[PDB]
Short mmCIF file of C-alpha atoms in Angstrom, two decimals:
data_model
loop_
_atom_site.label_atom_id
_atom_site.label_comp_id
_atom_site.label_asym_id
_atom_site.label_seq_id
_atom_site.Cartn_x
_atom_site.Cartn_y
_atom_site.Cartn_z
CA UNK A 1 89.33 70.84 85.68
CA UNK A 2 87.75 68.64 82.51
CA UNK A 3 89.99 70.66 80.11
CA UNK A 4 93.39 69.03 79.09
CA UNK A 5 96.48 70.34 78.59
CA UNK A 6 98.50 69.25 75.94
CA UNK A 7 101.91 70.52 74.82
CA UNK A 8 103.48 70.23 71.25
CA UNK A 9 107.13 70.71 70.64
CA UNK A 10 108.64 71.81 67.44
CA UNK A 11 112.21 71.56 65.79
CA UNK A 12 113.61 74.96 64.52
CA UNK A 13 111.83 76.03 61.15
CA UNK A 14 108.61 77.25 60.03
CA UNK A 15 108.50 74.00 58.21
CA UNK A 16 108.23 72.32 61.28
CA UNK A 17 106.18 74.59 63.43
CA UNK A 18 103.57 75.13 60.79
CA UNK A 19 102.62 71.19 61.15
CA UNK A 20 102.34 72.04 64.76
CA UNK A 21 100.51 74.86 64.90
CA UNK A 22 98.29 72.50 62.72
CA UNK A 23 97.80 69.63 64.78
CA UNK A 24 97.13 71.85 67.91
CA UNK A 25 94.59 73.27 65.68
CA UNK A 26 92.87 70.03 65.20
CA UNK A 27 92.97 68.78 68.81
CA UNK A 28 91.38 71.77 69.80
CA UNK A 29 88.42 71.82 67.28
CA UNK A 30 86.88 69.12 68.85
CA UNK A 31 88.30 68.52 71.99
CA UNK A 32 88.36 71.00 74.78
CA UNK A 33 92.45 71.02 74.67
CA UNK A 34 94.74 73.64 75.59
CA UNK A 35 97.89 73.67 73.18
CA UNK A 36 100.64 74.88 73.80
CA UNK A 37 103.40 74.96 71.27
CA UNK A 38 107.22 74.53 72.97
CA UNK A 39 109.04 76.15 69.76
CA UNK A 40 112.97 75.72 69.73
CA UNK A 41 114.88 77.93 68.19
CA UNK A 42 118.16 79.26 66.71
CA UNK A 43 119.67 82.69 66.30
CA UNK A 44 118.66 85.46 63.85
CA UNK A 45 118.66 89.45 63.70
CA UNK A 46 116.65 91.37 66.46
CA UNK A 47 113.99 88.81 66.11
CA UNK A 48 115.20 87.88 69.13
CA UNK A 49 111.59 88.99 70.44
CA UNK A 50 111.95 85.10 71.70
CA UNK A 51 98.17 83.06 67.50
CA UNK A 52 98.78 83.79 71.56
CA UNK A 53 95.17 83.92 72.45
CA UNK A 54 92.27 85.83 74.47
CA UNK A 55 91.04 83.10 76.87
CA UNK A 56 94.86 81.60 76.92
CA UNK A 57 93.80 78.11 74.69
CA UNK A 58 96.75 78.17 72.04
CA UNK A 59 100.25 80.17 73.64
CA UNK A 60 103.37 79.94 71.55
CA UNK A 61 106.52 79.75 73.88
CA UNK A 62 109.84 80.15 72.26
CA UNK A 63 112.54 77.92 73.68
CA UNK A 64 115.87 79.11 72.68
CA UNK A 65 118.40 76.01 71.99
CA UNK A 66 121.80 76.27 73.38
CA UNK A 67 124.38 76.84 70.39
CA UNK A 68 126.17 73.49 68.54
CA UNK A 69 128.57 75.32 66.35
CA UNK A 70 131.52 74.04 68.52
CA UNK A 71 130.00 69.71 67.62
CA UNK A 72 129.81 70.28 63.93
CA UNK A 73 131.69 71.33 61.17
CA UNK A 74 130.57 72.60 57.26
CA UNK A 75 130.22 68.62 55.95
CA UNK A 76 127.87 67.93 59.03
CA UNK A 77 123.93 66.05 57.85
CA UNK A 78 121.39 68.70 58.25
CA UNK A 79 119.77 65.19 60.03
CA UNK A 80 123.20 65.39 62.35
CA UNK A 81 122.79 69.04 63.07
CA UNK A 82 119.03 69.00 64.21
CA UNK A 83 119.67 65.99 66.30
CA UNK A 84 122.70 67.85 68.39
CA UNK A 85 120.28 70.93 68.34
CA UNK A 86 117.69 69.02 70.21
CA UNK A 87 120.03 67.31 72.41
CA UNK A 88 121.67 70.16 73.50
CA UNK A 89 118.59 72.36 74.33
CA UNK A 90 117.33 68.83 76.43
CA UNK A 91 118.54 71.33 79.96
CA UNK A 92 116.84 74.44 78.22
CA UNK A 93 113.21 72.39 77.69
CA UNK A 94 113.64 70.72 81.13
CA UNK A 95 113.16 74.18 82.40
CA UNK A 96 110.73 75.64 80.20
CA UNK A 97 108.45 72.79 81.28
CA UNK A 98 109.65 72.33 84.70
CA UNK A 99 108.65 76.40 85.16
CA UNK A 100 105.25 76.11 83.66
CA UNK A 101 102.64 77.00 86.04
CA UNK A 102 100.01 74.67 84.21
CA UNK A 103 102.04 71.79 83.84
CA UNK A 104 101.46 69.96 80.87
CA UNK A 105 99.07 66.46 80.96
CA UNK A 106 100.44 65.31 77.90
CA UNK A 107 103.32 66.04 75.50
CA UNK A 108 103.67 65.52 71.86
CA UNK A 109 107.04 65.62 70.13
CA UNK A 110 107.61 66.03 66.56
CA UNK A 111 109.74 64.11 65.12
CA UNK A 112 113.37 65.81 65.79
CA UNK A 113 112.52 66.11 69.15
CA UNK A 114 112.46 62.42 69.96
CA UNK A 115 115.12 63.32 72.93
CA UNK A 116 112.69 65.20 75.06
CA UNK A 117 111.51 61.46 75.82
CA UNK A 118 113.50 61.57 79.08
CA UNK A 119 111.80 65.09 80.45
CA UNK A 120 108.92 63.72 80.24
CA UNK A 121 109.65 60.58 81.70
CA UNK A 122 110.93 62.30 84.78
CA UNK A 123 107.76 64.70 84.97
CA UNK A 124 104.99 62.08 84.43
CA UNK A 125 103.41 63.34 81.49
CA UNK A 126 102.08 61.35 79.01
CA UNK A 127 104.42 60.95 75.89
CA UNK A 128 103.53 60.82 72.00
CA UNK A 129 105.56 61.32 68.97
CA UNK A 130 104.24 63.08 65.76
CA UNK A 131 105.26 61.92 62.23
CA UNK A 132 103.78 63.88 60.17
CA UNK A 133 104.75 62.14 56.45
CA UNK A 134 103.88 58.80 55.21
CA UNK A 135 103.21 55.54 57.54
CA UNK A 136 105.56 54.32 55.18
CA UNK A 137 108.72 56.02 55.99
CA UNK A 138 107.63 55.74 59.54
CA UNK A 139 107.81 51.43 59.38
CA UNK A 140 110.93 51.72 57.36
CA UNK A 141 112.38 53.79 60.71
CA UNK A 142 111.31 51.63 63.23
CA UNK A 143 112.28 48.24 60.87
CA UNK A 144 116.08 49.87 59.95
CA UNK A 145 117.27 48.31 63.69
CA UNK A 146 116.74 45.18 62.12
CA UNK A 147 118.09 45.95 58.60
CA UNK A 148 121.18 47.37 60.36
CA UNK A 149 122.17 43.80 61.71
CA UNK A 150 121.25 41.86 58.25
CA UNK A 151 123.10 43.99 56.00
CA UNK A 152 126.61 44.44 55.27
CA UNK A 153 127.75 46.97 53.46
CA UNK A 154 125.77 50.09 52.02
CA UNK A 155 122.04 50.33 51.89
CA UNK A 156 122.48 52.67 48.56
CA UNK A 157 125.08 49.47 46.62
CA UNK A 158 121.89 46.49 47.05
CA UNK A 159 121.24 44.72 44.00
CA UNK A 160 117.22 43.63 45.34
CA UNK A 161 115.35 46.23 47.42
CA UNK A 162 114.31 46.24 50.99
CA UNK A 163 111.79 44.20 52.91
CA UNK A 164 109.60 45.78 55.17
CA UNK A 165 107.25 43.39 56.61
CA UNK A 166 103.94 43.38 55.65
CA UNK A 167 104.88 46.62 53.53
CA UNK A 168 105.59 47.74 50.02
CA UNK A 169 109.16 46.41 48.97
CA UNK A 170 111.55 50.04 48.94
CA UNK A 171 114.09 49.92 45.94
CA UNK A 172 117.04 51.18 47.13
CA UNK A 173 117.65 54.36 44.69
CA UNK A 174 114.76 55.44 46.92
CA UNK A 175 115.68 55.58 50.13
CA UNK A 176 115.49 58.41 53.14
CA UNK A 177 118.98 60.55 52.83
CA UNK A 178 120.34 58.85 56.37
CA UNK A 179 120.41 55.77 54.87
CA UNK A 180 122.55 56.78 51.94
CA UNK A 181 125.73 56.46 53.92
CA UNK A 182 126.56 53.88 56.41
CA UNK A 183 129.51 55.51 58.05
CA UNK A 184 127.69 58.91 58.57
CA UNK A 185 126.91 60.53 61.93
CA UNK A 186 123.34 60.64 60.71
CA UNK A 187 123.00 57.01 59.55
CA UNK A 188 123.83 55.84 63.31
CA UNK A 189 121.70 59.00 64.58
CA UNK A 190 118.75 57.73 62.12
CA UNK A 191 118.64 54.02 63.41
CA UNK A 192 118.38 55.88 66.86
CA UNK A 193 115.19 57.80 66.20
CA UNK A 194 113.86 54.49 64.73
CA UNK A 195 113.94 53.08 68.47
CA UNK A 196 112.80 56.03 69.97
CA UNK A 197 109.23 55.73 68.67
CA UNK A 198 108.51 52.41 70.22
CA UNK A 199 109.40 54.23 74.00
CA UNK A 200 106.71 56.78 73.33
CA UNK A 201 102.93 56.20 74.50
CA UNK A 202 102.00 56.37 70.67
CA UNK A 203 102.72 57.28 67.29
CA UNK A 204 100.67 59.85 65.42
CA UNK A 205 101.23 59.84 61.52
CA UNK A 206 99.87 62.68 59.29
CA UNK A 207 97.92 60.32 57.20
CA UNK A 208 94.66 58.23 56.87
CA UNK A 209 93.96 54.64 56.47
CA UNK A 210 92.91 54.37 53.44
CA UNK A 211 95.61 56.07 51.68
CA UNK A 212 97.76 53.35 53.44
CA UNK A 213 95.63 50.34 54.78
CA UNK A 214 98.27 47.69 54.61
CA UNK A 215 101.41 49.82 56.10
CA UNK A 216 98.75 51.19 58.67
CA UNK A 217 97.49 47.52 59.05
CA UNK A 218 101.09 46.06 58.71
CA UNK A 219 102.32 48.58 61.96
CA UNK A 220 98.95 47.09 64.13
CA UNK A 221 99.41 43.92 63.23
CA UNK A 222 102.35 42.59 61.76
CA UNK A 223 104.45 39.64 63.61
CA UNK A 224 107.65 40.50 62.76
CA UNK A 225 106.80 44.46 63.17
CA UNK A 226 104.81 44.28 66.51
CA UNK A 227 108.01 42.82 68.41
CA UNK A 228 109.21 46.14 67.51
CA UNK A 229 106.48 48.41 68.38
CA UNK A 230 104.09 47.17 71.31
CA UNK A 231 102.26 51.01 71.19
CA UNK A 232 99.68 51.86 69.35
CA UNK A 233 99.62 54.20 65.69
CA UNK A 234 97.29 57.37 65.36
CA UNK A 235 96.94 57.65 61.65
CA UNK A 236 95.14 61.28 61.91
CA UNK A 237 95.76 63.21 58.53
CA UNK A 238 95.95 64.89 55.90
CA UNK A 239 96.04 67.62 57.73
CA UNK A 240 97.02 71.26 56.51
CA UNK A 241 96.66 74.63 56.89
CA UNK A 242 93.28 76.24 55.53
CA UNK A 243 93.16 78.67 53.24
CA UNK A 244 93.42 82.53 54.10
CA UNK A 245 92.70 85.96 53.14
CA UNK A 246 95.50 87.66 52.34
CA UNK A 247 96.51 91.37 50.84
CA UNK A 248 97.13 91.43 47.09
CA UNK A 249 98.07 88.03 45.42
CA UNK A 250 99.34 88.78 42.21
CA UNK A 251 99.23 85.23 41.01
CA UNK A 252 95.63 84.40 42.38
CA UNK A 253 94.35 87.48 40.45
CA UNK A 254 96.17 86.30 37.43
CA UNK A 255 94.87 82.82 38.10
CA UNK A 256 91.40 84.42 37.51
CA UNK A 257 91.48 84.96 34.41
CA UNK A 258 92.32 81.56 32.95
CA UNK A 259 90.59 78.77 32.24
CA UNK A 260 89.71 75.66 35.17
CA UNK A 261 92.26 73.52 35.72
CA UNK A 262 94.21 74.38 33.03
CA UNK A 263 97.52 75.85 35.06
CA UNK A 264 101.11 73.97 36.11
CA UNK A 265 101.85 74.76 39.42
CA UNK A 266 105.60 74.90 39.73
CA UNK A 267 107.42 75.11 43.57
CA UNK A 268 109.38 73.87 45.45
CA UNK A 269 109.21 75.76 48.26
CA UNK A 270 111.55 76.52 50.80
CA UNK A 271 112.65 73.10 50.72
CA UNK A 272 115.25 72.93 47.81
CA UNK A 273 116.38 74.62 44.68
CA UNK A 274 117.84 73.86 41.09
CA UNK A 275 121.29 74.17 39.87
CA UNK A 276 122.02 76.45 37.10
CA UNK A 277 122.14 73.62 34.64
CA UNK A 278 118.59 72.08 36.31
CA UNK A 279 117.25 75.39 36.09
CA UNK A 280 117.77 76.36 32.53
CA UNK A 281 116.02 72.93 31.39
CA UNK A 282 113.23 73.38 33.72
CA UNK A 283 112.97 76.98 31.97
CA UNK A 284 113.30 75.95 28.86
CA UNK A 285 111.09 72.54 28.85
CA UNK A 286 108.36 74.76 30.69
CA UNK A 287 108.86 77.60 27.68
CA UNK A 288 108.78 74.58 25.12
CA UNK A 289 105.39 72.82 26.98
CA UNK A 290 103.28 75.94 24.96
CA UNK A 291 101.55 75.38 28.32
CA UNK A 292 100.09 78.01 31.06
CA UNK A 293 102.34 78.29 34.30
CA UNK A 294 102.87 79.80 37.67
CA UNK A 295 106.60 79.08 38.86
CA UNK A 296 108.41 80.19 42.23
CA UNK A 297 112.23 80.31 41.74
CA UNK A 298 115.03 80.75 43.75
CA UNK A 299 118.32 81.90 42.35
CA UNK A 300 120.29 78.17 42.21
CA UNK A 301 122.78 76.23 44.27
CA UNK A 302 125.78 74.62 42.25
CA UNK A 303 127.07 72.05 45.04
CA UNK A 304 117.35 89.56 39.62
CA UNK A 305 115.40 86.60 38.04
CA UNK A 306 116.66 87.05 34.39
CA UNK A 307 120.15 86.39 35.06
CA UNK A 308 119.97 82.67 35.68
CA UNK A 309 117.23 82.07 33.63
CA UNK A 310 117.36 81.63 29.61
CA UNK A 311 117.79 85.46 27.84
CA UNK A 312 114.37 86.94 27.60
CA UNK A 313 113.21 83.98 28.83
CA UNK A 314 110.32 86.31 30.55
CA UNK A 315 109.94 88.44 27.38
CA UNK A 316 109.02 85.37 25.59
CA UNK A 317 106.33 84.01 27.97
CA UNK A 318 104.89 86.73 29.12
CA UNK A 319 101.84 85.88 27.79
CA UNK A 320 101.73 82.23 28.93
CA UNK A 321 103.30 82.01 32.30
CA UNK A 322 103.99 83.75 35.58
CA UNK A 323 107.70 83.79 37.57
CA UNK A 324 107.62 84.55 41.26
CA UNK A 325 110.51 85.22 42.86
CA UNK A 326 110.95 83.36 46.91
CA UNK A 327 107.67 82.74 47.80
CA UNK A 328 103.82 82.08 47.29
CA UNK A 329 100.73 81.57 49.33
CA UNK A 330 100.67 77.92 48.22
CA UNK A 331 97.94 76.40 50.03
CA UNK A 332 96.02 79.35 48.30
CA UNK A 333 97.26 78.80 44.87
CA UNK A 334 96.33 75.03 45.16
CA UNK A 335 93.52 76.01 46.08
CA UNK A 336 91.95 78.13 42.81
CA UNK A 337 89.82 76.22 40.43
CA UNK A 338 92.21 77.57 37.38
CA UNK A 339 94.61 75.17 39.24
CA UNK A 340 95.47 71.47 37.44
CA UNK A 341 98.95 70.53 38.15
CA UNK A 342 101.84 70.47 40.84
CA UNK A 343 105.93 69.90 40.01
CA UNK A 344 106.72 69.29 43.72
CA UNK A 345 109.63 68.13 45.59
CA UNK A 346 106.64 66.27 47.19
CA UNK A 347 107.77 67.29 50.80
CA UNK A 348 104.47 65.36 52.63
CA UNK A 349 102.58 68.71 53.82
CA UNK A 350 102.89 70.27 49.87
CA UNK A 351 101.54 66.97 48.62
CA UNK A 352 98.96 66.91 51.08
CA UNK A 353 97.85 70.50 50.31
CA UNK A 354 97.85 69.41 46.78
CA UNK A 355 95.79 65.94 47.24
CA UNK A 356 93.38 67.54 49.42
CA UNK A 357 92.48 69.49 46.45
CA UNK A 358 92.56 67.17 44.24
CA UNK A 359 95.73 68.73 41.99
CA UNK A 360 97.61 65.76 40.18
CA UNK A 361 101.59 66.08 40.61
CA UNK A 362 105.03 65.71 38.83
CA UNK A 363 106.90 64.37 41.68
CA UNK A 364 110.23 66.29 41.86
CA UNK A 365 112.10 64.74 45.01
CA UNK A 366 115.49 66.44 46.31
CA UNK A 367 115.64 65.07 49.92
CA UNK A 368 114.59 63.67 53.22
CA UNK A 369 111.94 61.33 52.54
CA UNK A 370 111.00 63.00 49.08
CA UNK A 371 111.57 60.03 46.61
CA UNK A 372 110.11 57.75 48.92
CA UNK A 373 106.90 59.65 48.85
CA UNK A 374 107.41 60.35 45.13
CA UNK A 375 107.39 56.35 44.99
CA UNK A 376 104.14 56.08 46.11
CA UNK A 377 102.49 58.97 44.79
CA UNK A 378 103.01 57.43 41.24
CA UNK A 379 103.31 53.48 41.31
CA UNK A 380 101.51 53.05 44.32
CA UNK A 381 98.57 55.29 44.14
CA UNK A 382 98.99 56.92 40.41
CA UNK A 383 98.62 60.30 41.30
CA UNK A 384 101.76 61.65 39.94
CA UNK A 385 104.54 61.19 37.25
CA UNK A 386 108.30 61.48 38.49
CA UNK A 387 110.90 61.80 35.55
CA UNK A 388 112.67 58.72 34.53
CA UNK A 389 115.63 59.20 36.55
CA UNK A 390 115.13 60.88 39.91
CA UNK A 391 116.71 64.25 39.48
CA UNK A 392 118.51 63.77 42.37
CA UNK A 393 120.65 61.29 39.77
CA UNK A 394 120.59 62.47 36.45
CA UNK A 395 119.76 65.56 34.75
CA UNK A 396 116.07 66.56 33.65
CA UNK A 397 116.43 67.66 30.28
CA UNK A 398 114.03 69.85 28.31
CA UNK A 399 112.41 67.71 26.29
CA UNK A 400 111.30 65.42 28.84
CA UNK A 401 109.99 68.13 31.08
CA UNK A 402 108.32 69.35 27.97
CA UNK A 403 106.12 65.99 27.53
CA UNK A 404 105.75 65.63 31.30
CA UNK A 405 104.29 68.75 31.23
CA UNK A 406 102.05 68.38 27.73
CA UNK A 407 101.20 64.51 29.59
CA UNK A 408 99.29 65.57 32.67
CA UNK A 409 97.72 69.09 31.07
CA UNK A 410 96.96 68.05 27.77
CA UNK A 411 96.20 64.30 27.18
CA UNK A 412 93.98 61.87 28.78
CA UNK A 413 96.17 60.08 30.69
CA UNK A 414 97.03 63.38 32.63
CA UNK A 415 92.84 63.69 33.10
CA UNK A 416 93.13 60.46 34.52
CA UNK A 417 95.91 61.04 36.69
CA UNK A 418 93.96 64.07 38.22
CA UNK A 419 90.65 61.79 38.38
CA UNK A 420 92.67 59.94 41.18
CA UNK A 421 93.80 62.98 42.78
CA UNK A 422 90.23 64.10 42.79
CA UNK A 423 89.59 60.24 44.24
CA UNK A 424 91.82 61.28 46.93
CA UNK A 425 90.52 64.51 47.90
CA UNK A 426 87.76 63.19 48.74
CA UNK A 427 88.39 59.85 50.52
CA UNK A 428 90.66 62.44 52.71
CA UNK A 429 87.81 64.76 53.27
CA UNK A 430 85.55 61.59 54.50
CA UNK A 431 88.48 60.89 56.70
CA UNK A 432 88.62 64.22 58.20
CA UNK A 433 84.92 64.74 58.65
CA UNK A 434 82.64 63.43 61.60
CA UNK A 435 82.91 60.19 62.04
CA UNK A 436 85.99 59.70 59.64
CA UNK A 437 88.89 57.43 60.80
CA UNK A 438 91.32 60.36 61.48
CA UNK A 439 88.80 62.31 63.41
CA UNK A 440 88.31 58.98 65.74
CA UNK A 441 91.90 58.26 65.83
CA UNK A 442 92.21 61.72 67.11
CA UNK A 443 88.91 60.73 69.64
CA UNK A 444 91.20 57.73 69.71
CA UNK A 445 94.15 59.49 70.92
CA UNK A 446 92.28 61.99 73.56
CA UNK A 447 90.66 58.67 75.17
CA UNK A 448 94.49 56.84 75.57
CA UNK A 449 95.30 60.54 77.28
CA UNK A 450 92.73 60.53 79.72
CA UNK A 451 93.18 57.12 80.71
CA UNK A 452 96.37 57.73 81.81
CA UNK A 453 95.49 60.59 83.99
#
């Protein structure tokens, strides 16, 4: 009767339904909430089998999306192909929801799933959209209706950057990958999100005020932003997975051995790889560094670990760093003491894991929103160093990524640099704790839910 139901719908990907199975996590600490998770997919092996719990409070449902290979082609925007995804499984969630026996009494969209808006409508639930990166990227969304209409030609050609009001001016080598290409499906399908927001019954952003006080302040308040808006903006972060158990780590029981804060962290992910060419540098410049690393690789992208990498590359640093091939528990990893610096393609949730524990950063960005964040996480809040050129433009040769590495390990301006990140751990865990402006925004949030039912 008291308890709400709340529903949380995730894109394809497990790097969008880990940020969901994360916010569920959070409403229901402190809230009395069912979650459940409405998780679209896509096609794969016999995993077509498409944490479920005890007393029924967080259920994973699988929605299976209809198939879009007849509306794209090989040059379509991974952008394009998520938004026709979502659109086309629009029948498919109408009757996922529609057959639930406990109807929803509020539902949360990430941010691909913007198109759901309708469904809702039409059932009467209460409607909120999840960003989960920077309020940043979030007012330069909402705002790009109104750069559309005052710009000519490309975003990508200006010679001055890009006015946001009440926000940090964005240079335009930085900008979000939609907006790199003005006759692109995804430029005209990213202008479209952009108005979706303001239809929603709020905005939830995975971040906390003070990390950004005058975007946050800038979305409440601004004149020229609030014609825009009109709904309100639950800044509710950083929020991440916690750290687990797991059944032999290889690189946490190497990390053991060395010395505090004295390891580079090198990953990026899932979301991206190197070229052949990036790769070798990055080898070499981390080989030249004489400096301790752990480094996840996968084999590159030019459009057994030794064979793209420098001959007896391995061989040579055996006794200073550690390869990984695919994969790492990387919350974990961030999370050792021997731990003191990140390369990162600074996707939001690995620069959160890395900020919430305090682990300085050489911002890396490849795509989506990446240099945008990298932007801030070095000249706007100096916990970071990108290389001169984004990556993304020019080449990262050796030597560079050998003093960008010797900078933050070695010298004092990299102990610095990690004094801010250490800065921002914390101001993030006051945020989070009781009483914190993320956990109200969240009591926030659950207050404009039940007032509406």
């Amino acid at each position: 009767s008291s308890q709400l139901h709340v529903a949380i719908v995730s894109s394809p990907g497990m790097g969008h339904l880990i940020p969901v199975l994360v916010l569920g996590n959070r409403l229901a600490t402190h809230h009395n909430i069912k979650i459940t998770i409405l998780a679209i997919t896509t096609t794969s092996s016999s995993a077509e089998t498409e944490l479920t719990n005890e007393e029924k409070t967080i259920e994973i449902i699988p929605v299976p999306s209809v198939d879009i290979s007849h509306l794209i082609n090989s040059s379509t925007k991974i952008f394009t192909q998520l938004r026709l995804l979502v659109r086309e499984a629009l029948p498919k969630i109408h009757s996922t929801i529609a057959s639930m026996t406990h109807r929803p009494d509020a539902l949360i969209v990430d941010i691909f799933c913007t198109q759901i808006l309708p469904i809702a409508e039409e059932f009467n639930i209460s409607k909120y959209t999840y960003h989960p990166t920077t309020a940043w990227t979030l007012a330069l969304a909402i705002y790009c209706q109104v750069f559309d209409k005052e710009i000519e030609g490309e975003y990508v050609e200006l010679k001055e950057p890009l006015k946001i009001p009440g926000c940090k001016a964005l240079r335009p080598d930085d900008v979000v990958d939609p907006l790199l290409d003005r006759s692109d499906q995804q430029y005209e399908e990213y202008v479209k999100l952009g108005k979706e927001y303001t239809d929603f019954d709020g905005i939830l952003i995975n971040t906390w005020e003070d990390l950004e006080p005058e975007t946050i302040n800038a979305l409440r308040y601004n004149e020229k932003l609030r014609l825009l808006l009109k709904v309100p903006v639950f800044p509710i972060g950083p929020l991440r997975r916690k750290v687990e158990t797991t059944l032999n780590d290889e690189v946490i029981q190497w990390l053991d051995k060395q010395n505090n804060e004295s390891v580079l962290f090198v990953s990026f992910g899932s979301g991206g790889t190197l070229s052949t060419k990036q790769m070798t540098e990055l080898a070499w410049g981390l080989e030249l560094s004489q400096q301790k690393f752990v480094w996840v690789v996968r084999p590159p992208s030019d459009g057994d670990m030794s064979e793209y990498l420098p001959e007896g590359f391995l061989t040579r640093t055996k006794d200073m760093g550690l390869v990984v091939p695919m994969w790492a528990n990387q919350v974990e990893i961030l999370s050792h003491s021997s731990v003191g610096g990140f390369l990162t393609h600074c996707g939001w949730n690995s620069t959160v894991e890395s900020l919430t524990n305090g682990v300085p950063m050489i911002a890396w960005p490849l795509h989506a929103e990446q240099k945008m964040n990298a932007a801030m996480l070095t000249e706007e809040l100096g916990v970071a160093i990108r290389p001169a050129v984004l990556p993304t433009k020019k080449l990262v040769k050796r030597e560079e990524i050998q003093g960008m590495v010797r900078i933050l390990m070695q010298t004092k301006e990299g102990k610095r640099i990690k004094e801010k990140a250490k800065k921002l751990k914390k101001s993030a865990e006051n945020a989070l704790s009781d009483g914190g402006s993320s956990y109200n925004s969240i009591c926030e949030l659950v207050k404009d839910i039940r007032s509406r039912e």
